[PDB]
């Protein structure tokens with residue numbers, strides 16, 4: 001079966017698209033090599049269509065079925081509730097795409113009668129009709145990257161009314177089920193701090209540890225009808241209200257399995273037979289399916305004492321080594337199984353005998369030292385993409401503020417502390433916008449966050465040590481420095497100087513601003529201040545699922 005069929009109608013934009021990095025008075029202070037940064041547009045949609053369009057063959061053995069049975073047995077302990085309309089409505093982002101039927105996200109959020117009435121009619125229709133394919137819109141994503149150009153990713157989503165109904169039927173399910181079924185393997189349950197601790201403990205729990213990342217080529221496209229039905233059977237194991245059972249079944253037959261694709265101008269672009277990127281179940285479904293296939297593949301490959309870590313389509317396995325030669329052999333078998341299960345890798349997996357050499361979700365584990373000299377482990381990444389996006393956000397206001405999300409999730413890193421914190425606090429100070437709440441994304445969910453709350457947020461997510469880390473590793477330092485040269489970003493020494501200024505300016509404002517200066521920029525001073533404590537973020541993945549929290 002083909003992942004997609006196309007009519008030839010173009011994937012069209014819904015507004016003006018910029019590909020070239022916007023430049024303002026602030027731009028050069030962050031980034032000089034402007035031509036290396038770009039944003040994807042609909043212009044490249046055709047190239048992506050080619051990539052994501054292919055035939056899927058599936059061969060399912062006893063290992064696959066054994067694992068599924070186990071997953072279902074755990075799922076049968078889950079009790080999920082129906083969300084009311086009002087509850088579902090409040091989970092809708094303020095700037096979520098408006099309905100084709102004469103209302104928008106704010107109307108939904110305000111419980112306007114027109115909005116509520118349509119939502120009730122969509123719900124009723126889901127209960128009564130389990131066969132009619134539900135329409136979806138296909139769009140090209142506008143995302144920023146550094147050169148070496150990627151084609152635009154595609155997003156596929158149904159109407160607002162349907163999206164609210166998805167929440168009613170499935171929000172509690174996709175929030176609770178994955179942790180019950182996958183236990184400690186479910187990655188979205190951890191803060192970054194908890195994650196690092198889990199990965200370290202897992203690595204140490206093996207006598208002779210070996211690990212590898214496994215990245216499936218175009219995962220969404222590899223997801224077949226079988227997989228989506230199997231996901232449903234898992235959901236249906238839950239203790240559910242009968243109305244919820246019917247809705248979930250209906251949503252599966254009519255939306256999740258597949259459906260027609262309509263562009264922004266209202267033309268039929270073709271047909272989908274794979275995972276929709278823009279539904280509530282995208283994250284949960286991918287996670288379950290990846291876990292199922294991977295666990296089965298571990299058994300097929302005879303890997304000993306396998307621990308899986310799965311979130312969305314991202315996968316890492318840590319297990320007991322059999323030796324360098326046997327390990328390499330076992331991974332080829334693992335890969336053969338995954339491919340049979342329809343998920344071949346983009347890049348072939350490589351066994352690793354050092355935790356820090358494993359990359360997943362663009363991140364790796366690294367080490368610094370805290371105030372006492374004690375080794376602290378933390379999560380970092382290549383800062384190329386964060387810096388590219390920060391540059392864009394310096395000249396343009398965007399729906400999602402990546403810089404803020406990056407500061408939050410990567411607060412312990414040298415690059416986030418020295419560059420991102422310094423640069424953006426400087427900007428906020430000059431505009432006196434320290435107290436203004438900004439929108440950002442954490443594990444696919446949208447949050448409204450006041451920058452002044454950063455120190456408190458960071459202490460909770462990472463611990464007090466985030467504000468005093470030093471003696472970063474040479475490998476990490478060199479990666480950052482090399483990236484800075486590549487993008488024409490000033491060197492870290494300059495950022496130190498700027499941070500002193502920003503710190504002093506924050507302290508002069510007093511109050512919460514002073515606390516930001518004290519904790520966030522303590523690294524900038526020679527004579528450090530003594531840092532003391534300050535008086536459902538990580539439940540599930542929601543990427544593409546139109547979820548919001550205040």
Ligand SMILES: CNC(=O)c1c(-c2ccc(F)cc2)oc2cc(N3C(=O)OC[C@@H]3c3ccc(B(O)O)c(F)c3)c(C3CC3)cc12
Nearest residue numbers: 187192309310311314315316358360361363364409443444
């Ligand atoms: C299956 N892979 C893993 O669980 C992970 C390993 C890993 C595992 C084994 C190994 F050997 C080495 C690294 O590192 C991770 C880092 C993060 N992250 C985080 O917590 O802070 C920031 C970073 C992050 C956040 C969000 C997004 B986003 O929504 O696209 C992102 F792309 C990166 C995460 C987050 C849950 C996704 C997941 C893993």
